[PDB]
Amino acid sequence: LKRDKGLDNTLKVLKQGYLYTTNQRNRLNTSVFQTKALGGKPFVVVTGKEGAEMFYNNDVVQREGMLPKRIVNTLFGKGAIHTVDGKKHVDRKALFMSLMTEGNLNYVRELTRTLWHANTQRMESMDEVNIYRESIVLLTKVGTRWAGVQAPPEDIERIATDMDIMIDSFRALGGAFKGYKASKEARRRVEDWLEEQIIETRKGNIHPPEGTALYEFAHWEDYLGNPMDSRTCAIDLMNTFRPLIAINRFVSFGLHAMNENPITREKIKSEPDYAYKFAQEVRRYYPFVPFLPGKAKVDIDFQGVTIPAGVGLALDVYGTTHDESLWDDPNEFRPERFETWDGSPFDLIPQGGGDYWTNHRCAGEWITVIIMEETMKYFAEKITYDVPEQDLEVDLNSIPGYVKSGFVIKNVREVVDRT
């Protein structure tokens, strides 16, 4: 079992970012390697379809307790679905997935579309529109409402900003960083606010619609017949739309891709299939989630080595979505590749792999793809705009993946036939 030796390589991981794992595999001449990180802890990094299958074998791999505490404290929340395994988890996961009905999915499609269409005058009005900001604000409205949480217009900028600080909070992979305390306070504000809405739903003082996150989560009972304590229920209710709001990352990359590859825009208009393909390729191609931590429950024999009981595991997400034996020219933006993709649950894993119900795979993959479809169709078809000179670098050596400028646009003008 090959090592990238060192007492702790955390700072090295942060310096190489999304290309750390690839650089070590290339340099050590192997598909599997160990590295100590997060304070002396050894992690075996596994990749590919074969890495993803094993990583989501629940007989062999534990997730419970393997997220760094600082990331639990800021991104996901204490006691979040992300932090439990086994029966307790499968039961709770069922609640999340129960929101993802055909009707709720069309509802998020319709909200996203209507708000974009409604937001054109405002965007014509601005000297310039930062798409990272503008989309996070617009998706805060979609996401609160989709979750049955009433958020006043007056409060959406504040809320959006608190979400942004949280979503970003994995940048130090669990280390100390200067924005950490601000991250914890944004979460506290958002948790208090959702806890209030839960307590008040349970008292019958407010009335979220049947089938919304707020309603289902407030009234749900676990497999022992106990409801979630109010705080944990607010934490998990957030886990139902903070990540929806975080799609702003992908809206921004979306516009970068369409701008770099202007051909994609025409095909978004010409081919009703293509918006789906484009959205999938934005998720595969661009960096967001670097890797996921787990731990070996027992020795595992994998790719000619033994992973010892107790060692850490890191499923390489960016590595698997850019694996040259899974995708021809993994570093070329090419939506048409998804004409052939067979729907495998172990290659396209930018929001996790495996099974929605039994593993920790993202609950909101279909919402992510739906929202990106409607957003990209909006930007391709209903408006024209200019892209001024700006820093459009996406630095693959810096976690998290952002377009440096946020992706700024000007001279927005609705596309209308007036003849």
Ligand X SMILES: CCCCCCCCCCCCCCCCCCCC(=O)O
Q: Is 136 in the site for ligand X (CB under 6 A)?
A: no
Nearer to ligand HEM, 288 or 379 (CB): 288
C-beta separation of 261 from 333 below 8 A = yes
CB closer to ligand X, 292 vs 409: 292
Q: Which of 186, 289, 326, 348 binds ligand HEM (CB under 6 A)?
A: 289
Sequence-distant (≥ 6) Cβ neighbours of residue 78 within 8 angstroms: 72, 231, 232, 235
132 binds, among ligand HEM, ligand X, none (CB under 5 to 8 A by kind): none
* Span 168-227, contacts to ligand HEM by CB under 6 A: none
Question: Does 418 show up as a binding residue in the annotation?
Answer: no
Query: DSSP state, 169?
Result: G
| Least Å from the CB of residue 171 to ligand HEM | 14
User: From the centroid of its chain, how far is CA 118?
Assistant: 26
Question: Could you tell which of ligand X, ligand HEM, none binds residue 242, using a CB distance below 5 to 8 A set by kind?
Answer: ligand X
Q: Is 233 annotated as a binding residue?
A: no
Of ligand X, ligand HEM, none, which one does residue 368 interact with (CB within 5 to 8 Å by kind)?
ligand HEM
| Residue 29, burial from CB neighbour count under 10 angstroms (0-12, 13-18, 19+) | exposed
Distance of CA 332 to the CA centre of its chain: 21
Q: Least CB distance from residue 43 to ligand X, whole Å?
A: 4
Least distance in Å: CB of 128 to ligand X? 27
Binding to ligand X by CB under 6 A, coded x per residue (else -) over 267-306, reads ----------------------x-xxx-------------
293 vs 61: CA distance, rounded Å: 10
| Residues linked to residue 314 through DSSP beta bridges, in sequence order | 45, 293
Identify whether the C-beta of residue 166 lies closer than 8 Å to the C-beta of residue 190: yes
Q: Which of 367, 403, 409, 412 binds ligand HEM (CB under 6 A)?
A: 367
Tokens of 374: 């409607």
**What is the four-CA torsion angle of 359, 364, 365, 370, rounded to 10 degrees?**
160
Give the number of residues in contact with ligand HEM, rule: CB under 6 A.
23
Specify the residue, 13 or 129, whose C-beta has the smaller distance to ligand X. 13
List all residues 6 or more positions away from 127 whose beta carbon is below 8 Å from its beta carbon.
410
User: Phi and psi at residue 229, in whole multiples of 5°?
Assistant: -60, 150
- Using the rule CB under 6 A, is 170 a contact of ligand X? yes
Does 362 help bind ligand HEM (rule: CB under 6 A)?
A: yes
Which pairing describes strands 2-4 and 33-37: parallel, antiparallel, or unpaired? parallel
Helix axes 263-270, 365-381, angle to 10 degrees: 100
**96, interface contact from ligand HEM, ligand X, none, CB < 5-8 Å by kind:** ligand HEM
Tokens of 41: 């802890």
User: In angstroms, how far is the first alpha carbon of the chain from the final one?
Assistant: 69
- Pattern 242-261, ligand HEM, x by CB under 6 A: -xx-xx--x-----------
Residue nearer to ligand X on the CB measure, 264 or 350: 350
Rounded (10°) angle between helices 274-285 and 365-381: 110
Spatial distance between the Cα atoms of 171 and 183, rounded to a whole number of angstroms: 11
Residue with tokens 């050894």: 42
CB count within 10 Å of CB 272 equals 9
Of 210, 394, 72, 301, give the one whose Cα is nearest residue 218: 210
Residue 248 binding partner per list ligand HEM, ligand X, none, with a CB distance cut-off of 5 to 8 Å that depends on partner kind: none
- Return the residue of 288, 318, 333, 402 that touches ligand HEM, per CB under 6 A: 288
Q: Which residue, judged by CB position, is nearest to ligand X in the bound state? A: 243
Binding to ligand HEM in span 371-390, by CB under 6 A: none
360 is in an annotated binding site: yes
Binding site for ligand HEM (CB under 6 A): 81-82, 93, 96, 239-240, 243-244, 246-247, 250, 288-289, 292, 351-352, 360-364, 367-368
Annotated binding site for heme b: 56, 63, 89, 93, 360, 362
Binding site for ligand X (CB under 6 A): 13, 21, 37-38, 43, 45, 68, 71, 75, 167, 170, 173, 242-243, 246, 289, 291-293, 314
